[PDB]
Curated annotation (Swiss-Prot), chains A, B:
This is Putative thiosulfate sulfurtransferase SseA. InterPro entries: Rhodanese-like_dom (IPR001763), Rhodanese-like_dom_sf (IPR036873), Thiosulfate_sulfurtransferase (IPR051126), Thiosulphate_STrfase_CS (IPR001307). SUPFAM superfamilies: Rhodanese/Cell cycle control phosphatase (SSF52821). Residues 29-136, 166-284 form the Rhodanese domain. It holds the Pfam family Rhodanese. It comes from Mycobacterium tuberculosis (strain CDC 1551 / Oshkosh). PROSITE patterns: RHODANESE_1, RHODANESE_2, RHODANESE_3. One of its GO terms (molecular function) is thiosulfate-cyanide sulfurtransferase activity. Keywords: Repeat, Transferase.
Length: 292, 292
């Protein structure tokens, strides 16, 4: 399928990476279009979803159940087959929590080189706010032949040691709440405080809450607004983003990579649940980025 | 001070490393004797303690507040000075939770090379069970001149990468509950389940609950009982022990090192809170140690 040419999107660096609700509704029933719901709430799809939408749950479908890592290429191909997704399909992903897990799913798809993956602008909440059609019907279509690919981490994923290496050398962006950034908490204010033995941020990390890039409706902010927000980023920068479990940072990862067109942006998916529990890693508290 | 020559202790490999309550009570008021309470419950000392006892709390006194590591040598010397402990003092440590944190404090003292550190056999709970004297009085004596030493981790502490290296090569002992070992839980049954993103044990780890080495009263089991329990350990072994935050494993560390006289035993203090949150480390579930 081709891109949404809506004026809301044309100013973005990769306008092909977002769609509007009107576009999606029009293009339902196209053979090459896959619609995927990805939520924090693993049982939210079961309450009602966009017609034609399949569920891909980040923890249960995309993570290894034993080791802290994603599934392999063989598993991903098996998943695509049973979800009715072909290699050349346009995949449009949406979900709750301001598209956090939808962006995270898009990022995971990118690990496996799926080329055309897009977000529904404003996600599940905008869809419902605008009283658009939902259904309990689950699509039956299955496919075969999705290629078993090499999972390609290096371009878009940063690991603990990678982060340690770039401290002071590259932009590091903490996208969490001020409570988390300053070291008052290890989780968001409205989430049970439990996950890390130390609180703070990674030295040199700058604080830019993920939500600065979206408006009240859940839609991404304009190119102009986003350009200002991340104006400090230069063409030669290899930006790293992080949060607690990588979901809010994948949202920022998406903003930087596709809406602003920045290159070499990596998500440090380990994030604070790794960093704040690791023995002998540098941590700073309070409002200052800190140094070395 | 010299060792407790009580027949209860003589069979142990290092009988100098334990004392009886009768010995301690007799030796109170000796100049070279320091008595330290170390608890899980940071405010338990304040409710009543052994006369002459000072408090050393593992988290607040012995840990760096920002980074996941212990304090440095300069800080330790400052701590010893204000607690009235001299370099040549006999330090007897006791506490709640079956001497877990007392053993952990002993281990930390050993990091800083304090030579004569002992546990009160049966700890705080036996002392109270036998209705021995407590007080609310806090000792006032302070000292100066405790040496600033090099903290010496390598002999007795294992780090994440060290553990990864010895998998299959050396004995690895998981001292947690069966629920934790098999991957049903990430914390003890009677503790809130919250701390790790993955559950299980480290591949090759064998399950020996810390409590097999102590009796109902909190006292350590006999040499004979302990020899049987850890009979599988050979002279050339470099044993590694672990739990969740290193406290139960320091208990086992103490049993192996001082009561059995095993050499090159290390505590992997990072333990499950590190391992079960680290990206891409091997994890196995169920009852089998597992392999490679």
């Amino acid at each position: 399928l081709p891109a949404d040419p809506s004026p809301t999107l044309s100013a973005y660096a990769h306008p092909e990476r977002l769609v509007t609700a009107d576009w999606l509704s029009a293009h339902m029933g196209a053979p090459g279009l896959a619609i995927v719901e990805s939520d924090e709430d693993v049982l939210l799809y079961d309450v009602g979803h966009i017609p034609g939408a399949v569920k891909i749950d980040w923890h249960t479908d995309l993570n290894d159940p034993r080791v802290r890592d994603y599934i392999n290429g063989e598993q991903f191909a098996e998943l695509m087959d049973r979800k009715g997704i072909a290699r050349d399909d346009t995949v449009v992903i949406y979900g709750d929590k301001s598209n956090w897990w939808a962006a995270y799913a898009l990022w995971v798809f990118t690990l496996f080189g799926h080329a055309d993956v897009r977000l529904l602008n404003g996600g599940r909440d905008l869809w419902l706010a605008e009283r658009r059609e939902t259904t309990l019907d689950v699509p039956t279509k299955t496919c075969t032949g999705y290629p078993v690919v090499q999972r390609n981490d290096a371009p878009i994923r940063a690991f603990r040691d990678d982060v340690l290496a770039i401290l002071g050398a590259q932009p590091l962006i903490d996208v969490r709440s001020p409570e988390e950034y300053t070291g008052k908490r290890t989780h968001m204010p409205d989430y049970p405080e439990e996950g890390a033995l130390r609180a703070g941020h990674i030295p040199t990390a700058v604080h830019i809450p993920w939500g600065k890039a979206a408006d009240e409706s859940g839609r991404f902010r304009s190119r102009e607004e986003l350009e200002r927000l991340y104006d400090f980023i230069n063409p030669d920068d290899q930006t790293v983003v992080y949060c607690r479990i990588g979901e809010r940072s994948s949202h920022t990862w998406f903003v930087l990579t596709h809406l602003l067109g920045k290159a070499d942006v990596r998500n440090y998916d380990g994030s604070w649940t790794e960093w704040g529990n690791a023995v002998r890693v540098p941590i700073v508290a309070g409002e200052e980025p800190g140094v070395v």
